[PDB]
Amino acid sequence: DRGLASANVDFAFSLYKQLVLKAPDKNVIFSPLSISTALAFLSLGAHNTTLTEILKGLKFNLTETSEAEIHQSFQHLLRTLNQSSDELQLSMGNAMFVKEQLSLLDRFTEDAKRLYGSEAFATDFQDSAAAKKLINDYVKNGTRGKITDLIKDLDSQTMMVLVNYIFFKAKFEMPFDPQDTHQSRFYLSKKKYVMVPMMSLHHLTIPYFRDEELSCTVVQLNYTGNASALFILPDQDKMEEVEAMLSQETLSRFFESLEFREIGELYLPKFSISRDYNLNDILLQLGIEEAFTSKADLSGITGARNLAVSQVVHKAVLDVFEEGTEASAATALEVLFQ
Amino acid sequence: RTIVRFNRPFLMIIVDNFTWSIFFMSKVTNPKQ
Ligand SMILES: COc1cccc2c1C(=O)c1c(O)c3c(c(O)c1C2=O)C[C@@](O)(C(=O)CO)C[C@@H]3O[C@H]1C[C@H](N)[C@H](O)[C@H](C)O1
């Protein structure tokens, strides 16, 4: 569905801008798809304002697609994506961890399994250490060990936690040769620079675009298996200016403006970065409000307005090296009683 | 003769070529470990 693709990209750029506001000079890494999917999963249980605030925050137009069609779109996307080859590995999972005695509507658990692939695991949250182990183990298994501590603190009164994870591992079509990796300057700013391992490729034809009006250069590196990485390289001191132009429209212009061009040398750092976030402030700014207050209506979960969101956390890791790229992320939505 | 040198902050967007899903988005302002 082209609608789902568009909403997910609009959400990605909106999230990105707010993540940067937190700390505008820090590395950023996140999975917008993981967050979109987790919140769409939550909305399966939401009604009324709580529901329309979630779906609108995710950048869907309810006037052009119904709730039923949004969930069917996620189901379809989840089925299309889950992929495994000696070429490329891609896994996404959803789960709910629920207080054992909490009575859930059959329609919710049926829907959650059918549409989002979600099991329901009985969890004793009053044994906080055991409950965190169960959730963190699920995410570690799903991300093949790359994310192990998504949950640090967990209220012992928690009623449920909805979890999404994504795992990605892929080889470059044109891999770098480790013999051509050498320590080189990386300019944190015009005046501050450090030495990093810098990979290099010589004489390569790849898609290329120089955006003079935005002062940036764009290249695409393919993975084997129909994923790719789009790299955007602002001119020095122009990263803030490029960030101010990002949008679905600009990304489209980037892709469409790419042309194959022979490149004499490409230099790219070998690097590994991780970030973790609490997303409450951002979701609130993005208009997802009632879910956090005693007005919350998550009565599609239980048959009463007796649940509200307490904490939304996200963790993501990105490893880029000569042969390819690994990246993982997870999102958890922690829910208390009301 | 064109050179592309990622020796300053850059963006990286990992996408599914068929569904146009953005799996991951990243700004690298300091890659050093
Ligand atoms: C609103 O646009 C988008 C928003 C979010 C993600 C995306 C896009 C998008 O437009 C897009 C693409 O257009 C293309 C791709 C893509 O992943 C996205 C998005 O992810 C993948 C693609 O480059 C490949 O198959 C490379 O292997 C094909 C294609 O590029 C187009 C334009 C190129 N110049 C060239 O013509 C290529 C063959 O088709």
DSSP, collapsed to helix, strand or coil, labels residue B28 as: strand
**What are the residue ranges of CATH 2.30.39.10 in chain A?**
172-268+328-338
Euclidean distance between CA atoms A145 and A156, whole angstroms: 26
> Quick check: B29 and A27 CB within 8 A?
yes
Euclidean distance between CA atoms A97 and A247, whole angstroms: 35
Q: Which residue in the set B2, B12, B32 is minimally distant from A229, CB to CB?
A: B12
Question: CA A202, A206, A212, A214: dihedral to nearest 10 degrees?
Answer: -110
Return the ∠ at Cα A100 (arms to A98 and A106), rounded to 5°. 70
DSSP, collapsed to helix, strand or coil, labels residue A45 as: coil
Euclidean distance between CA atoms A204 and A23, whole angstroms: 36
CA distance A29 to chain B (A): 4
Look up residue A169 and give its amino acid.
K
* Host H or E run for residue A132: helix A128-142
Domain A172-268+328-338: homologous superfamily in CATH: Alpha-1-antitrypsin, domain 1 (2.30.39.10)
DSSP, collapsed to helix, strand or coil, labels residue A69 as: helix
Q: Which CATH number fits domain A1-171+269-322: 3.60.20.10, 1.10.600.10, 3.30.497.10, 3.40.640.10?
A: 3.30.497.10
> What residue segments make up the domains of chain B, in order of their start?
1-33
The residues facing A228 across adjacent strands are A222, B15
Euclidean distance between CA atoms A312 and A331, whole angstroms: 7
Q: Are A317 and A29 in contact (CB under 8 A)?
A: yes
DSSP, collapsed to helix, strand or coil, labels residue A229 as: strand
Of the candidates A67, A108, A70, the residue with the CA atom closest to the CA atom of residue A304: A108
Return the ∠ at Cα A255 (arms to A250 and A256), rounded to 5°. 95
Euclidean distance between CA atoms B17 and A240, whole angstroms: 27
Q: Which residue in the set A26, A217, A318 is minimally distant from B29, CB to CB?
A: A26
Q: Are A55 and A62 in contact (CB under 8 A)?
A: yes
**Which residues of chain A neighbour B17 with C-beta distances below 8 Å?**
226-228
A231: left (phi over 0), alpha (psi -120 to 50) or beta: beta
Q: Which residue in the set B4, B22, B32 is minimally distant from A196, CB to CB?
A: B32
Where do the DSSP E strands lie in chain A? 28-30, 83-84, 88-99, 119-123, 158-171, 182-187, 193-211, 216-222, 227-234, 259-269, 271-278, 307-321, 324-337
Which residues, judged by CB distance below 6 Å to any ligand atom, belong to the binding site of ligand 1? A 9, 222, 228, 248, 251-252, 255-256, 258; B 15, 17, 20
Q: A276-301: b or e for each residue (b if 16 or more CB lie within 10 Å)?
A: bbebeebbeebebbbbbeeebbbbbb
Q: Are A302 and A277 in contact (CB under 8 A)?
A: no
Q: Are A200 and A180 in contact (CB under 8 A)?
A: yes
* Burial status of residue A103 (CB atoms within 10 A of its CB: 0-12, 13-18, 19 or more): exposed
Q: Which residues contact A141 (CB under 8 A, 6 or more apart)?
A: none
**What are the residue ranges of CATH 3.30.497.10 in chain A?**
1-171+269-322
Task: For an interface test with A, give the residue of B1, B3, B7, B33 to mutate (most A CBs within 10 A).
Answer: B7
Where do the DSSP E strands lie in A21-157? 28-30, 83-84, 88-99, 119-123
Q: Are A310 and A336 in contact (CB under 8 A)?
A: yes
Look up residue A35 and give its amino acid.
I
Q: Which residues contact A147 (CB under 8 A, 6 or more apart)?
A: A139, A140, A165, A315, A316, A317, A328, A329, A330
Euclidean distance between CA atoms B8 and A326, whole angstroms: 22
In total, chain A counts a number of residues equal to 338
Method: X-ray
Look up residue A275 and give its amino acid.
R
Atom 30 of ligand 1: nearest residue by CA position: A255
* Burial status of residue A36 (CB atoms within 10 A of its CB: 0-12, 13-18, 19 or more): buried
| Torsion sign over Cα A196, A201, A203, A208 | negative
